[PDB]
Write a protein that binds this ligand. Sequence first.
Ligand SMILES: NC(=O)c1cccc2ncc(-c3ccc(Cl)cc3)nc12
Ligand SMILES: [Zn+2]
Length: 197
Amino acid sequence: KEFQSVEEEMQSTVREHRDGGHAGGIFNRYNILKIQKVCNKKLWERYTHRRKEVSEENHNHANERMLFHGSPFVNAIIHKGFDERHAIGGMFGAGIYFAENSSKSNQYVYGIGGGTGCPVHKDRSCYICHRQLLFCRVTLGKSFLQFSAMKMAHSPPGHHSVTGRPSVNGLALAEYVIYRGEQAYPEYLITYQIMRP
Ligand SMILES: NC(=O)c1cccc2ncc(-c3ccc(Cl)cc3)nc12
Ligand SMILES: [Zn+2]
């Protein structure tokens, strides 16, 4: 039920991508293989301690959202947490990026722009190799709304995150950026394949 809800979010938020599948592959849906709840007490507490601090700075409201994250480093993330020291060249600078559309995070699973794809077949559209996405609790707090590229090193003054909003000459889909790794928790590890349309 918790997992059916995660599967529903994963499938229903897929969009057709402007790059025609170059980065993440060609698909309309996934084959969801496994959904695992990550239980890392030390990381959870690091997350909730910061969430409380952010809520206190944002009119008693954490502005928490469940968002996707794609990375070749899912294993390190679930053990050590998100780490801004790994994050300036990105559209919103040196942040940790999240999507509300699973297929946008799927474009980052094998690297920026999909890298060279899966390690076995070197295919960004591999229907064989199993992929992993994270479905994360993300504390946005007071989120700075931005439409165009703004290369920042940290959250804007008085803010806790950046929300990249869609615009005609800019973003096709939203994205959410934090500048402190403790503002996200890798709640669910989703193992899946993209499916041939
Ligand atoms: N990861 C996501 O799910 C993700 C979702 C949404 C937008 C992103 N934009 C940039 C990057 C990004 C990935 C790696 C590096 Cl090194 C820098 C930025 N990731 C993104
Ligand atoms: Zn493959």
